Amino acid sequence: GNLFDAYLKPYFLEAYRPVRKGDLFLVRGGMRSVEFKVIETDPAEYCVVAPDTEIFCEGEPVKREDEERLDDVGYDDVGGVRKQMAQIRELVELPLRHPQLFKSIGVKPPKGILLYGPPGSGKTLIARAVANETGAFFFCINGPEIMSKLAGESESNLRKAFEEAEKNAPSIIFIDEIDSIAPKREKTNGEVERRIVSQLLTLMDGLKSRAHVIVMGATNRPNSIDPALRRFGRFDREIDIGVPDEIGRLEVLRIHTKNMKLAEDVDLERISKDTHGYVGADLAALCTEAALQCIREKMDVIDLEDDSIDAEILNSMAVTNEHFHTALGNSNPSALRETVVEVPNVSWNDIGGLENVKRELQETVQYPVEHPEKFEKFGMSPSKGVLFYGPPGCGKTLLAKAIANECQANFISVKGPELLTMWFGESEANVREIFDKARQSAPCVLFFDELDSIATQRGGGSGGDGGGAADRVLNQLLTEMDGMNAKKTVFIIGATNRPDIIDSALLRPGRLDQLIYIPLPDEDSRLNIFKAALRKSPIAKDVDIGALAKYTQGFSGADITEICQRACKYAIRENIEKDIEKEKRRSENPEAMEEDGVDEVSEIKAAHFEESMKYARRSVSDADIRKYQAFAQTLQQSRGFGSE
Amino acid sequence: KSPNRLVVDEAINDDNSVVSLHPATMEKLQLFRGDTILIKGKKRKDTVCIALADETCEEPKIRMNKVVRSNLRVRLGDVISVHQCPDVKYGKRVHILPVDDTVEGVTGNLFDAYLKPYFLEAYRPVRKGDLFLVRGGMRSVEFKVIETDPAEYCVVAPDTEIFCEGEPVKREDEERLDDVGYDDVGGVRKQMAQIRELVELPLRHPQLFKSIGVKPPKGILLYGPPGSGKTLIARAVANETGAFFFCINGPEIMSKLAGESESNLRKAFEEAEKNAPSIIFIDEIDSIAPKREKTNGEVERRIVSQLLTLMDGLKSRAHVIVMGATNRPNSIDPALRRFGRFDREIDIGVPDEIGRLEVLRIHTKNMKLAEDVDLERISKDTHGYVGADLAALCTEAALQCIREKMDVIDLEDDSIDAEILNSMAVTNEHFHTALGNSNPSALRETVVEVPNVSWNDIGGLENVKRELQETVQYPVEHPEKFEKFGMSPSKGVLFYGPPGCGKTLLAKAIANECQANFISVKGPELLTMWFGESEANVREIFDKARQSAPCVLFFDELDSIATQRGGGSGGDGGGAADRVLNQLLTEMDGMNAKKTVFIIGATNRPDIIDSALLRPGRLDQLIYIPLPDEDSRLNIFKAALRKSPIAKDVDIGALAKYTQGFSGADITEICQRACKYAIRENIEKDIEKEKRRSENPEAMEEDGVDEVSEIKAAHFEESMKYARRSVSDADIRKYQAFAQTLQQSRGFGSE
Ligand SMILES: Nc1ncnc2c1ncn2[C@@H]1O[C@H](COP(=O)(O)OP(=O)(O)NP(=O)(O)O)[C@@H](O)[C@H]1O
Ligand SMILES: Nc1ncnc2c1ncn2[C@@H]1O[C@H](COP(=O)(O)OP(=O)(O)NP(=O)(O)O)[C@@H](O)[C@H]1O
Ligand SMILES: Nc1ncnc2c1ncn2[C@@H]1O[C@H](COP(=O)(O)OP(=O)(O)NP(=O)(O)O)[C@@H](O)[C@H]1O
Ligand SMILES: Nc1ncnc2c1ncn2[C@@H]1O[C@H](COP(=O)(O)OP(=O)(O)NP(=O)(O)O)[C@@H](O)[C@H]1O
Ligand SMILES: [Mg+2]
Ligand SMILES: [Mg+2]
Ligand SMILES: [Mg+2]
Ligand SMILES: [Mg+2]
């Protein structure tokens, strides 16, 4: 159709753009990217396009003539991975682009790369992007393709792949689904599988005498791979392509929506915030669903017999926020149960009070991390083990997240139920994975919430004599924390609402020995908590938050948040009833004057707070408060005689 | 672009002459309702049909049944042209003959058997060369209009002559009007809608999709209990889209010698890529691609890998869609549930009551049901019956009718009289016997349905109703207001109180009020999953609530699984309880993101409930349901006695009076025992009447209508005499004490 006004006119109308004969430029729109080659320019091969300049696009399509696809996967088509992609670039680009320098130096760079991560997180995409950006001869070995071909042909295919890679040096050998090729020996129950595994190992070993050949495997998790592949010469570098954080999801959405014209009010930030647990594949699928919904809506406009759709129609198909909302509702996460490494959004302002705890945490965590040189100079190393104890709802988790955000360090959240539910503790390796992750993501803050269910004292505090899961997990944690002292930039924090039953082994130096007591908020702390909870909410001026903070002794932050939630529920009920009454009044007299005095500004009135307080109640008895105060000087005294 | 060009779609009414159009479009075209119009489709075929108004349809679409579409040689998604033709004339004579294939066997006076009922009542349009379907005698007969007068288009009238003395006519490349379609599948409207939206758009319009550049999904996996469809749905979709349908069967592939299985898969995919648009239905895909942990062979792995390679290669496809089918997704290898491979999963589950009614109507439309055959009763009495069971019970009823009527007709006749077949009416007794002789197949499967319980079924608990409306209904139906106000609500509730108070009826009632799905889960059901060893099943349940959003996932009998670790747990070595509790905690932590899933609990032992479930995000909204007061007891008595005959002398207010500390269950048992006493009295009176008749059979027959049995006050007195309390006052005071102490368990406590 009229490609000119559809693509070129928006592309040149605003900015004065340089142009050179023979160059191809890419224009995105209509759910597709179009490459335009400059056939001719005036007055010379180099020109600048201006509004008065004439543009001629009445000719026939031009051939590619050995040009590369500008839509090929590149570093700009991969989002949510900047650190991992940087590592991959530093490993790959330098030798492949400059093999002569490396062979002249004499130093041997690594050749074994293993991208492990949840399905849909990239891996295949990253390898194609690296291959296209380096131009290296890319050979894509596919696990199932090898495993389908008859016996003897699989080994032949592997041998041919490696030999051809050694001929087209510099080269890359991407082994997708390497778990099928090389599963654990404990799982494989066949001879041909072992033969293929051994052939792969032999070829990787022979790649020591290589020609600038890099092997780039890919698997869902490293455990499913045979251990022999994770050794020297073989796949020795391992890169975790994990679930992207919020900004990564935003980048993925921008990547998958750049060819589409988004309508106004389509807030990709909202979708990214609402897409927790979504790997890049899910975010590409929801965008596709939204586009298909838009196409279905606009199909009635255009007859369905036309072979080609009008370019103007495609460029005018604007995807509305409703389409994305429906697609998100119809879609579900794929990596929801995967451990997530991210910098939490919680800051100091989100927590009210606990100023001394903030001071101690800054002195204990922030200074070792951001200022390790001073600690080394002073002559001794700090302790990397903290243990929050206190009444429930006091804000332990918000403090761990807050300190992680302040230090700009990673945060891994682990709960006792999550540890135990790992096949009732039988899949012990998973635990050893978590700490390993903290070793990769250093600096890190590995938080262990709900320690009252796993760290139960052996016998005295443990609810199940035959429940070996708790003791097994506790012993694994103790061993790993013993092994984690060497890592300078890993801090392990705990949290238990049952300090009496916490196993004293965790209180040993090196382990979680820095006991920190978080008390029930005082009057000022309660005022601060009310302010924090009511933040980002409309509140009436007649509400004296100071009065609410007054009295209300022994109220945890959770109770205060529930108070606000119930007050908001009452306000919502009142607004709904008022809207219903307005609708009834309109129905009785639809011709009545429309009193359009702007939408009512709903605010939490003092009556709603009074009702919420009336139906509100305490969650910590004074007996518990005094017992916690007593354990403020007795919890540490459990490693020796005690625990009864 | 014209106002008379419309996209065909599925119809509501199954008649072969009614065509429903949106009233806006009819007014645009100036069409009189109930008048004749002419429709032209593909090739050069056209039909004459009577139009009607239907606001449900959209302006750019017209709804027709499979008969009219077949006459027009148009599938769904095609476009047809409509022209007003009120000048149609009544026909003096019509020569109509049946088809050989459809009429094979049955012979006789087909005219009065099929055509006369079909034309006697309504004036029906007819067009030469068109085939119409008549259902009866446990079969459908296709009649082709050989000739019409005065023109090819006519309207049949009572005075019109009908000639059906000719021989059977050949099919002549016509399609079987009995082929499976969307009208032959019932109990699946949402799932079928998803399948249509995924499949019909690309297959019918592949050129548009390849021009747009967007890639639609190709991997579809229908998972559900056996007998729920799957195979039927794929055939229906293939027949409705006309796409080249290749049916790969798991066992057929696995039987052929080694090397031939891979060859067959390769040939299937290659041929599908040649007949594009196409579909590749892989039935019993669990046998082809079972879990690696289960397969113990090399050829199996080779076939799995070949299938994976072919699915991956289908990225460079020719409008090819793969439509697998399995009983459950767990038995399938995980590799198949990834991107490019089977990424869309549709649950063809057990139909609800209306779905069972639709299935029964589908399987009884070819049969003439006698009066008093209430299909609603059967559907209500067929819980746990998948479509196969409902098709088998109808078949059993038909066979019972045939056996009963066999004595009338000699058994040597090759063909049965058509009148006899049309006069074989299936009685409710046949269906009752068939239902008694049949058993459910999906009884143990989790059921997602909207419960029938409403607020009226529960008496009292007005404040609980208020809280539940403020806590559940408003977030669901009004989420925008919650988002605007600046914070999100809690999705965790916990009913606690004496047994028999009505927790389950409240969860079902709120689910019905919100018109949201309801999943009922009991602690015994969780534990009995191989004593908690089959942990994945638990993760399935929550996943189901994620598919059926909005949902109300109820956990009854939490006193058996949520027992406090050690203090409240009866078994130290019973790791099942702790394992299930930890799984629930993890899943509820993972469920907070899903806005439209509400998790409700219920425990009659709040003291031993694990405090972990009381954490915010988890079941933190504690709700106490007390023993009914006097007014509540009166309301419960009214609810229980509802839909029952009760004598006027019974003062239900007096029954509600006193009777302190009586749960609703005790009140229901009171009514049940009173009804038992009334039944005994009626039986004794009938026996005495029979004895009196036997003594004097010639006595006057005092036919004063059947006695109107009512629960007399004496029956209630006896029931109360034998009735007793189920909650001691000590329990009542302990519950009141825990009304302010249950929440105080997460910190110090639990002893
Ligand atoms: N991080 C990402 N950034 C951008 N697009 C992505 C990202 N991850 C996935 N996608 C998109 O989603 C598609 C499917 O994911 P892909 O990365 O190809 O699967 P995979 O990770 O190779 N699967 P498996 O090998 O089974 O674990 C990609 O081809 C991209 O289109
Ligand atoms: N200091 C605080 N300021 C503001 N809100 C707070 C504070 N402390 C607690 N809250 C609120 O209460 C919630 C629960 O606090 P959290 O940090 O999860 O306590 P916990 O003791 O780790 N929980 P649990 O293990 O369930 O007893 C927070 O997410 C806030 O909503
Ligand atoms: N939802 C349904 N609506 C109408 N008829 C149905 C339905 N489900 C099953 N039937 C009927 O019952 C028959 C048998 O069920 P069918 O759906 O063919 O088995 P299946 O689900 O393919 N079995 P499996 O593949 O072993 O799980 C169908 O061919 C129909 O005649
Ligand atoms: N408010 C009520 N109104 C009417 N009938 C009621 C009411 N409460 C209880 N019932 C009757 O009692 C039955 C049992 O109530 P249900 O809701 O199952 O209580 P529960 O506490 O969940 N049961 P359990 O766990 O066995 O103690 C209902 O099915 C009704 O027959
Ligand atoms: Mg891949
Ligand atoms: Mg905690
Ligand atoms: Mg089948
Ligand atoms: Mg219950």
Side-chain angles (χ1 to χ4, degrees), chain B residues 456-461 497-506 554 556-557 559 602 604 632 635-637 639-640 663-666 668:
Chain B
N456 298 13
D457 292 70
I458 59 177
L461 307 178
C501 287
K503 299 176 268 290
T504 312
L505 279 64
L506 265 170
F554 190 81
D556 213 333
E557 292 290 349
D559 54 63
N604 299 322
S632 299
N635 304 319
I636 295 162
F637 270 102
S663 55
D666 300 359
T668 303

Side-chain angles (χ1 to χ4, degrees), chain A residues 348-355 358 392-395 398 518-535 545 548-549 552 554-564 609, chain B residues 487:
Chain A
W348 301 114
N349 298 13
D350 292 70
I351 59 177
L354 307 178
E355 307 297 346
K358 295 168 182 167
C394 287
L398 279 64
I518 312 200
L520 300 91
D522 299 0
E523 287 74 33
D524 187 0
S525 299
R526 282 192 289 272
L527 167 56
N528 304 319
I529 295 162
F530 270 102
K531 292 308 308 180
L534 298 163
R535 177 172 54 88
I545 304 177
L548 278 293
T552 313
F555 263 83
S556 55
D559 300 359
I560 292 171
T561 303
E562 292 174 4
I563 289 170
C564 297
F609 272 107
Chain B
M487 52 187 173

Side-chain angles (χ1 to χ4, degrees), chain A residues 89 110 171 285-286 379 487 515 524:
Chain A
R89 287 181 55 190
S171 58
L286 86 76
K487 194 68 171 183
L515 279 296
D524 187 0

Side-chain angles (χ1 to χ4, degrees), chain B residues 229-232 235 249 281 283-284 325:
Chain B
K230 301 197 284 294
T231 305
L232 188 75
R235 294 203 301 259
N249 190 23
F281 174 71
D283 208 358
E284 289 83 21

